[PDB]
Amino acid sequence: AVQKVVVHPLVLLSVVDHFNRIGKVGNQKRVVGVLLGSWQKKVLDVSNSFAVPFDEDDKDDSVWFLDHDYLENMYGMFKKVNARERIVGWYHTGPKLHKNDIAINELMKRYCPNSVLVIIDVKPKDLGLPTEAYISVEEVHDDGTPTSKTFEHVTSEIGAEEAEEVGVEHLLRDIKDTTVGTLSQRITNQVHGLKGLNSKLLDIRSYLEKVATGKLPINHQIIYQLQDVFNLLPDVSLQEFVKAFYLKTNDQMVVVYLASLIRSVVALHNLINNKIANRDAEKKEG
Amino acid sequence: MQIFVKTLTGKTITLEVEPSDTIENVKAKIQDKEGIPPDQQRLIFAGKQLEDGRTLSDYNIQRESTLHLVLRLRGG
Amino acid sequence: ENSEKIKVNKTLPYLVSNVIELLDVDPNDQEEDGANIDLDSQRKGKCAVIKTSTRQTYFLPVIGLVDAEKLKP
Amino acid sequence: KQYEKSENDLKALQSVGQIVGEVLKQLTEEKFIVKATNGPRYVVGCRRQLDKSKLKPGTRVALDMTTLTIMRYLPREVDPLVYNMSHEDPGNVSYSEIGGLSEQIRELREVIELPLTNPELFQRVGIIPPKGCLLYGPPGTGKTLLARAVASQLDCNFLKVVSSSIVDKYIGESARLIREMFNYARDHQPCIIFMDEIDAIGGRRFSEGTSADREIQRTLMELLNQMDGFDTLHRVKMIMATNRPDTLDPAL
Amino acid sequence: EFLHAQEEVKRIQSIPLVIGQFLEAVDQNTAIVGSTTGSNYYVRILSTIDRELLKPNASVALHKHSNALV
Amino acid sequence: MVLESTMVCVDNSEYMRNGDFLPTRLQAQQDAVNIVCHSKTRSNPENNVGLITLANDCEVLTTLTPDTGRILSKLHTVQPKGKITFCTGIRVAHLALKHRQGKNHKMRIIAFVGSPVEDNEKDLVKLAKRLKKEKVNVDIINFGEEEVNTEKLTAFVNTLNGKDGTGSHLVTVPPGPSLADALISSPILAG
Amino acid sequence: CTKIINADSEDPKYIINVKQFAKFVVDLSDQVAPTDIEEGMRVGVDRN
Amino acid sequence: LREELQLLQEQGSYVGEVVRAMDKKKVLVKVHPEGKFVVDVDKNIDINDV
Amino acid sequence: AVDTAEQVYISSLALLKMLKHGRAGVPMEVMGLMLGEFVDDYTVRVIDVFAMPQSGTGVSVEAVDPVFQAKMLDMLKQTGRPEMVVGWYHSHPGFGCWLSGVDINTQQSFEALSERAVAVVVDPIQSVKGKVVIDAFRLINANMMVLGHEPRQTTSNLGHLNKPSIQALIHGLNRHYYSITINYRKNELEQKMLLNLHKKSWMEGLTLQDYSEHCKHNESVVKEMLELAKNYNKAVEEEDKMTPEQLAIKNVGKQDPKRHLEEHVDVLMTSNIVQCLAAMLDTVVFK
Ligand SMILES: Nc1ncnc2c1ncn2[C@@H]1O[C@H](COP(=O)(O)OP(=O)(O)OP(=O)(O)O)[C@@H](O)[C@H]1O
Ligand SMILES: [Mg+2]
Ligand SMILES: [Zn+2]
């Protein structure tokens, strides 16, 4: 239904400052706010946000509040001050997918049809992309309940823009990994993404904690993929997968062998370009 | 009677007026305390815009109610 | 106060010109506030195009002190 | 009410005139490249609201004076010589008033009135109707009068030309009108061009005696090319008149 | 640090930009152009332009006020 | 003036659906809400009047707003159908008044109960001592029909205005379908 | 120095003309009468 | 490299055409279509070199 | 008096609202408010920024109804925590930074209630990626301009560090206003979480690259690299010749071999060494 989402770094930042402004409560508060944006060409866009007053008490945690007058007038100001801008859905600060977010989405779907949510990070530590988004799908289906509804993650990335790329690249001024040569790939995804595969091997190790001791629902629809992964584990090293591998090493290295051969001759022509400027000035200048 | 003039600048200005006074006399009293002509001033009482042609009693402004002061804004 | 201020900005060096064409342009779609402008395309009457005697053409959205009825190309 | 006019006059004196330009091509999404009617070519930007896709190469736009960016697109101009050439005739003379030459009246009707109303007959035979025709004869036989019969029939897309207002002492302004008359002619598709006393602009040619008839033969050869050079000359009929057709260019 | 200053120099490549035409160069990194206002100029260049994309009769950008090669 | 915020909790439970009261049970309590929101507005212009429910789905039907045009629009075909759930009615009343724009207002709530409740008296007394630590004064007004000589509500008001509260009451319902404009003349006259 | 096209009634409001540039609406100075500023006559004019 | 940000704001140099020099260190130079200018020389340029 | 060491702290959060609102309506002069937190006579802190609906012309830009202003500030007090208007900004489109004759006028309106309303210009054109040219200002009295008296009584070695542009010096600087040196409030609260959130990927490197065409692309470069080396088998041969400073000015019409010949060697290396290494890890890891 939706291809992907596009998040600007402003709305990425426009939650953190509110997380600072309610950080004096100390005890517990999740930041929940209205997400504004304009989805076009089946691509979800996210532009602007604010945060709505929201509290939560732990005993009987089914009692939420959205001050809709604050939602009515401030969006009416925002529809005034940017008529290109509209509602796109909502968000919450999302540490660990709290329970009220099954009907918050159903509370305010009378504005946005595909009222998408966004889970963000306030304490960043990962090896992935710390912005997560779901979508609302419902089912009268296989086994669980007559009324069943579960969120599904549509893929997420941080979109840039020519206005804000001026800003963020001025705001970094920090340790950087520019000059992409032979080394940026080695550290953006060869040092890093191999350890990125750690926390996904270890993630399914964490579901594996129920062998005879963990939580009481057992499998039914979790193991059809896990049965496939050991089935779609790749081909063993006996076939011409051995032979055609040596074939292309015997082709890819020849281009490197030519290209390195050129590198020696070019700097040797540079060597004479310094022996023309060494000997032809010691008699001239002194 | 006393009134409150609560600006957008966190600041509250107290004035002594009469209920039959016009708004242009109120903005003249702010000019006596600040030095700003009444064209550069906008007075808001409970989300309503005030006009100099009417008095305080037409808008039911009484003793020690709160006004809002926003200034005129023209850039170039 | 207005007739004083008009007299100040009615000051006589006058770069005389020629009326090329007198428009009929429609309001735009879509305009928004925040960067709203009452000067471009909120009314339809009247815009015009002039040519000065320094061989310079100019567009004008606002005519000025003269109205649109008694003007013609 | 007198005060209400004096307040819009306050509202008048914030407006700034805008540079009339023209779009040449489009470099990137924001890099545009234009040339004013003043002079030099400029590289320019636009608004982020004003349809950056619609700026085709060719159109006429408006600019800012201070920052020099595109504020607005505009349609084409209609060059007020030609607007005051178009529809300023209140003449109401008719075919009942002309008399004696009804053979030519039906002859002249055939090129200007018949295929404009019923074109399907020529398409069946397989020939194209004529572009135009001329009227020669001794002076005072009804040459100018016969066009005035047709002039009381159209009123909006009939173009009478005196063939002496089209020349002036600037460099290219004599040939700019002939471009911008026929550009007005294609924009109003049922249209008739009338060209009275073409001997001023027609001529034959010369071995280049004076300096004056340098830039008239340029003004003449612009007319010859705009008739039948690389353009379907369609629905644009031309009527010309003279007292003596001795002094005409054989290429015309 | 050089790559940070490498990209910083193009703030002169802003939007009010006028058009000339390349004519010749006296020497390294200084050239002679002709604007579309009729008058020719002896201008300095900007260093990051590949010099080997010049002179058939090249269209060039010029600065608005200072009127140098852009 | 005096700082409070009047918060009405309407009754859209399914036992309020008949026609024993004369126009409608719905419209009779509606004009009772209409006259008290004219009594709180005209005695204090700062008080906004919005409505909440205490049904199975504790919805913000209308927002807490000083306009009643949304209140007047929703209370027609409001569909008063649903199981009563008053045990979360304390939480949806109290946490609403912490979403207000002023905490220096007096927390004043009225509650309309016109249905048999199935609460635990041991659960509300933990919620009543919760309101002792939250310093909340609620005048509960009984409508409709209920367990007569209202069970668990005398015990809740007593554990509401305890510990030097001594100011809240329990307006009980008479089991007679009379005109309800005279029943609520005691809260509008005094406290 | 310039060349005057015409005067007009009720007011000075002279129409002036220069060599290649535009035509302006001008006024006198204090040091000259409006008498000998008859039409079609070359006159000297400040630059501002 | 970072000098040129504070170097290119210096306005450009005109190009002209020498006709002939004269007494007291000056030359007669005309510009494109602009009139002839009697201008002086700089100290690093010889008159007989012009 | 003041010490010309004013040191306006802003933020990390406000400037992105400044440029986005400044650039979305760039050729018109958009503007807004500055909602911050005052500190002592020396420094000031501006933390939040919001705009208003406006109405403009070419040379002027105005505001509209003041009921937008008070209702906006009430909603920002109840959500978050209350603040106070420390100033105002506007946006010259592609100009630079100065106070024009109308920009100075509404500043004069705002400096009456508090005397430290900071006037801020943001140019979202001149800012390419680095410098963001901003240069906040504040008025000086033209009465002391009449006195010929030089204000602001320099008592710290901090003001005369950044030099003004000549174009802003053509305008009212320095006869009616002054410049202020500023920096940015940076913290792990924000600085860590825009770096480690923006330029990140997940699979772009544990994957192969169009395996039948990468080796095909390893001929799409090498084929013309032969003839480009034939030019390198040409250009060295015309040396021991006319004084190779001449071989700089002359060769600006056409491409040289020598620089272009080491250009593809970097490309023909990293395209191969990455694709060879990334394939030889999946042999180990995947069974
Ligand atoms: N056939 C005619 N019937 C009636 N009146 C005529 C006729 N021919 C000419 N006239 C009269 O002669 C006058 C001149 O007409 P017109 O200008 O058309 O002559 P012309 O042929 O155009 O001569 P020229 O080309 O020298 O002007 C008209 O006003 C008309 O009244
Ligand atoms: Mg005739
Ligand atoms: Zn400005």
Side-chain angles (χ1 to χ4, degrees), chain A, chain B, chain C, chain D, chain E, chain F, chain G residues 1-2 4-46 48, chain H residues 1-41 43-50, chain I:
Chain A
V2 175
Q3 182 180 2
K4 64 181 180 293
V5 302
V6 171
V7 183
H8 292 85
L10 270 79
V11 60
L12 180 146
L13 183 146
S14 178
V15 186
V16 183
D17 50 357
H18 185 271
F19 184 75
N20 196 5
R21 290 193 298 272
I22 58 97
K24 63 183 179 181
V25 72
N27 292 317
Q28 181 63 42
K29 184 173 180 291
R30 63 182 69 89
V31 173
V32 176
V34 179
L35 200 76
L36 280 76
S38 176
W39 67 91
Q40 291 176 358
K41 298 295 291 181
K42 300 284 102 176
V43 176
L44 200 288
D45 194 6
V46 182
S47 299
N48 195 1
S49 289
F50 58 93
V52 64
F54 180 77
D55 290 327
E56 189 269 333
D57 294 332
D58 57 352
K59 292 183 183 293
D60 197 1
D61 53 354
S62 298
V63 179
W64 57 85
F65 288 100
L66 299 182
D67 192 76
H68 295 90
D69 195 4
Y70 184 80
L71 187 146
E72 288 298 329
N73 291 318
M74 192 174 181
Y75 175 71
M77 293 181 181
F78 288 166
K79 183 65 178 176
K80 174 168 69 177
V81 79
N82 192 356
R84 180 66 64 194
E85 194 73 26
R86 66 183 185 272
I87 41 92
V88 75
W90 59 280
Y91 66 94
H92 64 96
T93 190
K96 297 279 102 172
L97 199 151
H98 295 282
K99 190 263 290 180
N100 284 317
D101 297 329
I102 191 67
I104 299 296
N105 195 351
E106 295 296 324
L107 183 62
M108 60 180 289
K109 199 185 283 186
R110 75 266 186 102
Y111 297 97
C112 181
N114 47 2
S115 301
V116 62
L117 67 96
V118 167
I119 288 174
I120 56 99
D121 194 357
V122 291
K123 294 184 287 184
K125 69 284 189 188
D126 57 344
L127 282 79
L129 283 82
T131 58
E132 199 275 336
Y134 288 108
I135 203 64
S136 295
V137 290
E138 67 276 15
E139 69 274 15
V140 190
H141 277 88
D142 295 333
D143 191 76
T145 50
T147 307
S148 180
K149 186 182 290 182
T150 308
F151 292 101
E152 294 296 325
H153 176 76
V154 183
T155 183
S156 176
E157 64 184 2
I158 303 300
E161 187 180 2
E162 183 67 28
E164 64 191 4
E165 283 177 350
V166 186
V168 291
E169 294 185 356
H170 179 73
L171 286 175
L172 289 173
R173 295 298 292 154
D174 203 359
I175 184 67
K176 290 187 284 185
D177 199 73
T178 61
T179 67
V180 176
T182 188
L183 61 89
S184 178
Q185 293 84 13
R186 297 287 179 267
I187 280 90
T188 195
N189 219 156
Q190 301 294 99
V191 164
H192 185 268
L194 271 299
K195 301 278 96 162
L197 194 146
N198 188 21
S199 299
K200 273 71 190 174
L201 200 162
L202 195 276
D203 187 75
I204 71 169
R205 180 69 180 271
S206 66
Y207 183 80
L208 185 147
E209 296 294 327
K210 59 100 188 173
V211 170
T213 58
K215 63 184 181 293
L216 194 273
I218 298 297
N219 288 121
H220 295 171
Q221 200 277 127
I222 196 64
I223 46 93
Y224 293 160
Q225 296 178 358
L226 272 300
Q227 183 175 359
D228 197 9
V229 170
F230 287 170
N231 193 5
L232 205 141
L233 188 144
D235 186 70
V236 293
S237 178
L238 55 85
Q239 196 61 254
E240 293 89 6
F241 180 75
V242 183
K243 302 283 101 173
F245 183 75
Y246 290 166
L247 182 77
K248 301 284 103 172
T249 302
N250 207 4
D251 287 329
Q252 188 175 3
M253 195 63 72
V254 186
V255 182
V256 179
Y257 179 69
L258 181 60
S260 178
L261 180 63
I262 301 300
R263 186 178 294 275
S264 61
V265 185
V266 170
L268 184 62
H269 185 272
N270 291 320
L271 192 276
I272 307 302
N273 292 319
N274 203 359
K275 301 288 104 176
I276 198 68
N278 195 1
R279 196 262 300 164
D280 287 325
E282 295 294 325
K283 192 263 179 182
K284 300 284 101 174
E285 180 178 359
Chain B
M1 64 181 183
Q2 292 181 357
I3 53 171
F4 292 110
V5 181
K6 182 178 178 181
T7 66
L8 303 182
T9 68
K11 186 177 179 180
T12 304
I13 296 169
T14 61
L15 292 172
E16 178 68 29
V17 292
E18 295 295 325
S20 66
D21 292 334
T22 56
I23 304 297
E24 64 186 1
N25 292 320
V26 177
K27 293 179 182 178
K29 291 182 184 292
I30 303 169
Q31 188 175 3
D32 293 332
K33 289 176 70 175
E34 294 294 325
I36 292 298
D39 57 353
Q40 292 182 358
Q41 297 178 359
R42 297 291 184 271
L43 291 176
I44 300 302
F45 181 76
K48 297 295 291 183
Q49 186 176 1
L50 296 177
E51 292 179 352
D52 290 330
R54 293 180 185 269
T55 63
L56 295 173
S57 63
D58 290 330
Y59 294 97
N60 293 317
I61 299 167
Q62 63 180 356
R63 184 182 65 188
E64 292 182 354
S65 293
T66 299
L67 294 172
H68 295 283
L69 179 61
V70 185
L71 298 174
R72 180 177 181 266
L73 183 52
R74 180 178 290 173
Chain C
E1 186 179 3
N2 302 329
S3 67
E4 189 273 335
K5 191 261 185 180
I6 297 303
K7 188 270 304 296
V8 171
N9 297 315
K10 184 265 298 297
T11 308
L12 278 75
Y14 289 167
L15 191 75
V16 311
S17 73
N18 289 315
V19 176
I20 296 172
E21 194 271 334
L22 188 143
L23 272 305
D24 275 325
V25 295
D26 55 350
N28 213 176
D29 194 359
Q30 184 60 258
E31 183 69 27
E32 69 186 5
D33 295 333
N36 201 184
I37 171 165
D38 204 4
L39 190 279
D40 57 351
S41 62
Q42 298 301 106
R43 69 186 187 275
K44 83 285 293 177
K46 190 55 73 69
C47 299
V49 178
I50 55 98
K51 182 183 285 185
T52 72
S53 296
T54 60
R55 285 89 172 94
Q56 296 298 108
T57 61
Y58 291 95
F59 183 80
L60 50 92
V62 177
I63 302 169
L65 300 176
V66 183
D67 53 352
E69 289 84 2
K70 63 175 73 67
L71 294 180
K72 64 184 179 180
Chain D
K1 189 267 302 298
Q2 294 299 112
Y3 182 68
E4 185 63 27
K5 190 260 184 293
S6 68
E7 290 292 317
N8 296 318
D9 295 335
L10 298 180
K11 294 172 69 176
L13 206 274
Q14 290 88 23
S15 64
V16 176
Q18 293 184 357
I19 303 291
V20 173
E22 194 271 332
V23 175
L24 273 57
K25 65 184 289 183
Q26 178 178 0
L27 292 170
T28 66
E29 181 66 28
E30 69 275 15
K31 296 295 183 182
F32 290 86
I33 169 173
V34 294
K35 179 176 72 67
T37 61
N38 187 1
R41 294 181 176 94
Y42 291 149
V43 178
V44 74
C46 288
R47 298 182 67 185
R48 295 178 69 187
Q49 287 75 240
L50 262 292
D51 195 359
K52 293 180 179 180
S53 66
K54 192 173 85 273
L55 299 178
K56 274 80 68 181
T59 185
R60 194 265 300 276
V61 295
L63 275 299
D64 185 75
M65 290 181 66
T66 60
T67 187
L68 192 62
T69 58
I70 290 175
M71 293 294 173
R72 192 189 298 104
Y73 66 100
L74 289 176
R76 297 185 66 187
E77 70 276 16
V78 290
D79 64 345
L81 273 302
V82 181
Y83 182 80
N84 287 317
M85 192 181 288
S86 302
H87 58 87
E88 68 270 10
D89 175 70
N92 297 118
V93 298
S94 65
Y95 293 94
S96 66
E97 183 171 358
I98 185 62
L101 41 88
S102 64
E103 297 293 324
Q104 292 85 15
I105 300 170
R106 190 263 304 153
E107 180 70 25
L108 190 273
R109 184 175 294 169
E110 191 175 1
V111 65
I112 61 166
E113 186 170 357
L114 195 274
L116 270 296
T117 61
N118 195 357
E120 295 293 327
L121 275 72
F122 298 102
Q123 294 173 354
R124 185 175 180 179
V125 177
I127 54 99
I128 301 170
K131 295 180 175 67
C133 65
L134 80 155
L135 299 171
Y136 67 99
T141 61
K143 291 181 259 72
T144 309
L145 184 61
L146 192 146
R148 295 181 66 192
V150 181
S152 63
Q153 189 175 1
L154 273 299
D155 202 14
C156 182
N157 298 327
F158 180 76
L159 291 178
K160 67 280 187 188
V161 175
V162 302
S163 176
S164 295
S165 64
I166 64 170
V167 54
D168 53 350
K169 67 179 178 68
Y170 291 160
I171 302 300
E173 293 291 324
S174 297
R176 188 179 63 83
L177 296 173
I178 293 173
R179 292 194 296 276
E180 294 176 353
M181 285 189 290
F182 290 159
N183 288 320
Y184 180 80
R186 272 84 50 83
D187 291 334
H188 290 173
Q189 193 61 252
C191 66
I192 307 299
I193 300 296
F194 181 67
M195 196 75 197
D196 194 4
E197 297 293 327
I198 201 168
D199 295 332
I201 199 66
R204 185 182 297 275
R205 292 297 173 92
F206 285 100
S207 296
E208 203 179 4
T210 185
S211 176
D213 50 2
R214 265 77 160 172
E215 69 268 12
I216 300 297
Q217 296 176 358
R218 296 182 181 93
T219 309
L220 191 273
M221 286 185 280
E222 183 66 28
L223 179 62
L224 297 178
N225 197 2
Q226 195 62 38
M227 290 183 186
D228 56 347
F230 297 98
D231 191 3
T232 299
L233 194 274
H234 61 281
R235 303 291 184 90
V236 178
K237 309 285 101 176
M238 296 178 186
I239 299 170
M240 292 167 180
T242 180
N243 296 115
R244 53 183 300 166
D246 296 330
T247 69
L248 291 174
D249 197 0
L252 190 142
Chain E
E1 192 271 338
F2 179 74
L3 267 297
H4 181 267
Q6 183 61 254
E7 58 90 17
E8 181 63 33
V9 74
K10 67 183 177 67
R11 56 93 48 81
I12 197 166
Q13 295 179 355
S14 63
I15 201 64
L17 194 63
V18 306
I19 297 170
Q21 183 177 1
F22 188 81
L23 296 177
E24 72 266 12
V26 167
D27 54 352
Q28 185 57 255
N29 68 21
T30 308
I32 295 96
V33 298
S35 173
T36 54
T37 65
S39 59
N40 305 113
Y41 293 100
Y42 179 68
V43 301
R44 187 62 65 86
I45 54 98
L46 193 272
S47 295
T48 75
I49 290 96
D50 180 76
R51 286 90 167 92
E52 298 176 349
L53 298 174
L54 293 172
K55 185 58 178 66
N57 281 316
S59 294
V60 294
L62 298 176
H63 189 75
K64 182 67 180 294
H65 178 77
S66 174
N67 198 358
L69 191 275
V70 172
Chain F
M1 294 296 171
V2 55
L3 292 175
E4 72 271 13
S5 294
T6 302
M7 187 66 202
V8 63
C9 183
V10 298
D11 195 3
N12 55 357
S13 67
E14 68 184 2
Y15 291 102
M16 296 297 291
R17 291 179 291 175
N18 61 16
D20 58 352
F21 292 100
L22 181 66
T24 307
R25 287 189 169 177
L26 282 71
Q27 188 177 1
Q29 67 184 357
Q30 181 177 1
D31 291 332
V33 172
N34 288 121
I35 60 98
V36 299
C37 73
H38 291 89
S39 180
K40 297 293 185 181
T41 305
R42 274 71 171 174
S43 179
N44 192 2
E46 295 178 354
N47 295 325
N48 51 0
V49 174
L51 62 91
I52 206 71
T53 184
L54 48 80
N56 193 4
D57 195 0
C58 293
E59 293 179 353
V60 181
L61 281 77
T62 69
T63 318
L64 177 60
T65 184
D67 193 5
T68 186
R70 186 180 295 113
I71 285 91
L72 290 176
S73 67
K74 298 295 186 291
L75 287 174
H76 295 91
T77 181
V78 76
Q79 191 63 41
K81 181 175 70 66
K83 182 66 178 176
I84 185 169
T85 306
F86 184 73
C87 184
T88 187
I90 294 99
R91 183 63 65 194
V92 74
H94 184 272
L95 190 65
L97 271 77
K98 290 188 289 187
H99 287 84
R100 292 181 292 111
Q101 64 183 357
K103 296 183 291 294
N104 296 112
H105 295 281
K106 179 69 174 179
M107 293 180 284
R108 185 178 295 275
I109 298 169
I110 63 169
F112 289 162
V113 176
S115 295
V117 67
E118 292 183 354
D119 195 1
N120 192 5
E121 63 182 0
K122 292 178 68 66
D123 289 335
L124 59 90
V125 71
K126 295 187 291 293
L127 292 173
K129 65 177 69 67
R130 182 68 178 172
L131 292 177
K132 292 182 186 294
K133 300 299 292 295
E134 289 171 350
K135 193 178 71 175
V136 180
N137 293 114
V138 174
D139 289 331
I140 298 98
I141 301 167
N142 288 312
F143 286 167
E145 72 274 16
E146 192 179 359
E147 181 68 29
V148 71
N149 297 115
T150 64
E151 194 268 335
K152 294 181 293 291
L153 277 78
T154 302
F156 183 72
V157 174
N158 192 5
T159 57
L160 194 148
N161 60 8
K163 299 284 102 174
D164 292 332
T166 191
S168 295
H169 298 89
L170 181 65
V171 178
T172 62
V173 57
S178 177
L179 296 178
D181 293 332
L183 274 68
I184 48 92
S185 179
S186 176
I188 197 169
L189 185 63
Chain G
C1 63
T2 68
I4 295 170
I5 295 170
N6 58 355
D8 52 355
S9 296
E10 186 188 1
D11 282 324
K13 289 183 177 65
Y14 292 158
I15 302 299
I16 206 164
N17 192 2
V18 302
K19 187 63 177 66
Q20 287 93 16
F21 294 161
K23 279 77 70 178
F24 295 95
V25 179
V26 299
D27 201 0
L28 284 83
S29 71
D30 292 329
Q31 295 180 355
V32 284
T35 61
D36 293 331
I37 316 296
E38 295 178 354
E39 295 181 352
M41 188 185 293
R42 298 175 70 194
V43 291
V45 158
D46 55 348
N48 295 319
Chain H
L1 194 275
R2 62 183 294 164
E3 183 65 29
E4 297 179 355
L5 284 82
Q6 195 54 255
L7 192 274
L8 296 179
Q9 283 73 238
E10 181 177 1
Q11 65 273 13
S13 175
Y14 294 165
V15 58
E17 183 67 33
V18 175
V19 176
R20 59 105 174 86
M22 73 287 287
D23 194 2
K24 63 181 74 65
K25 301 294 292 182
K26 295 179 181 67
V27 291
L28 190 272
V29 176
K30 67 181 291 183
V31 210
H32 52 96
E34 196 175 2
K36 299 178 176 66
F37 289 151
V38 175
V39 298
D40 53 353
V41 303
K43 66 181 180 65
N44 295 318
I45 291 95
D46 293 333
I47 296 173
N48 54 0
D49 187 76
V50 178
Chain I
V2 293
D3 65 340
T4 181
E6 294 180 356
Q7 187 59 255
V8 174
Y9 292 160
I10 304 99
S11 70
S12 296
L13 75 96
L15 182 141
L16 293 176
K17 298 292 184 183
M18 291 288 287
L19 58 89
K20 184 178 76 175
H21 186 267
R23 179 60 172 168
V26 54
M28 197 180 303
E29 184 175 0
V30 295
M31 59 85 53
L33 259 296
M34 290 167 66
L35 185 63
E37 191 272 334
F38 276 99
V39 285
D40 57 350
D41 184 74
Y42 297 104
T43 58
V44 76
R45 185 179 295 171
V46 44
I47 184 166
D48 201 0
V49 158
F50 67 100
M52 76 291 290
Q54 301 174 5
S55 179
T57 59
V59 74
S60 298
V61 57
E62 301 175 356
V64 296
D65 55 348
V67 294
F68 181 79
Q69 297 299 111
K71 190 180 285 292
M72 189 67 203
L73 290 178
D74 196 3
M75 294 177 182
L76 295 175
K77 289 182 179 176
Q78 64 183 356
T79 299
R81 80 275 178 271
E83 292 175 359
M84 192 278 200
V85 281
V86 293
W88 68 282
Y89 64 96
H90 68 88
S91 299
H92 293 293
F95 292 159
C97 47
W98 60 83
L99 270 299
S100 66
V102 184
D103 286 330
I104 195 166
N105 290 320
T106 187
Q107 191 278 138
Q108 189 268 329
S109 303
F110 287 166
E111 54 90 21
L113 274 300
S114 292
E115 293 180 353
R116 293 180 294 172
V118 180
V120 171
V121 171
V122 58
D123 191 88
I125 285 174
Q126 295 298 111
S127 63
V128 274
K129 298 292 184 184
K131 297 297 293 296
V132 289
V133 178
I134 179 80
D135 198 2
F137 301 113
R138 190 183 295 161
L139 190 73
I140 204 67
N141 204 171
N143 205 167
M144 196 178 289
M145 183 67 201
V146 175
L147 265 295
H149 188 277
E150 290 84 4
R152 292 180 52 74
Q153 55 98 29
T154 303
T155 55
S156 175
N157 207 167
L158 191 147
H160 299 283
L161 268 295
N162 297 318
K163 300 288 104 176
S165 69
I166 188 64
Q167 292 85 16
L169 190 63
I170 294 168
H171 296 85
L173 188 143
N174 204 161
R175 293 178 292 174
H176 298 89
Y177 60 90
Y178 58 87
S179 296
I180 303 168
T181 62
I182 62 172
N183 55 359
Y184 296 103
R185 298 180 62 86
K186 295 183 288 293
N187 50 0
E188 186 181 359
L189 180 60
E190 195 273 332
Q191 293 294 117
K192 197 266 179 186
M193 70 181 303
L194 195 145
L195 188 146
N196 206 1
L197 269 73
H198 181 70
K199 294 293 186 181
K200 290 173 79 68
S201 64
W202 180 249
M203 286 173 65
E204 291 79 355
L206 258 299
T207 60
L208 274 302
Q209 194 279 129
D210 199 1
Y211 195 82
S212 180
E213 296 294 326
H214 182 275
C215 296
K216 179 66 179 295
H217 187 272
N218 291 320
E219 185 63 32
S220 301
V221 178
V222 182
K223 186 180 262 77
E224 70 271 17
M225 186 267 172
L226 189 148
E227 185 66 31
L228 203 280
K230 183 65 181 292
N231 208 168
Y232 187 64
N233 204 3
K234 181 69 175 181
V236 178
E237 285 78 0
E238 63 250 12
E239 295 296 323
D240 192 74
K241 292 297 288 185
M242 188 67 197
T243 173
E245 57 89 19
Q246 186 64 41
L247 271 293
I249 179 169
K250 181 170 88 272
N251 299 109
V252 304
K254 73 277 193 185
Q255 56 91 31
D256 55 348
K258 181 70 181 297
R259 183 177 178 178
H260 195 199
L261 194 271
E262 65 182 0
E263 189 271 333
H264 295 287
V265 173
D266 195 6
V267 177
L268 288 172
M269 192 67 70
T270 67
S271 176
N272 287 317
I273 302 303
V274 169
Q275 197 275 124
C276 180
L277 193 276
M280 297 197 78
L281 298 177
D282 299 327
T283 62
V284 170
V285 174
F286 293 163
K287 184 70 175 178

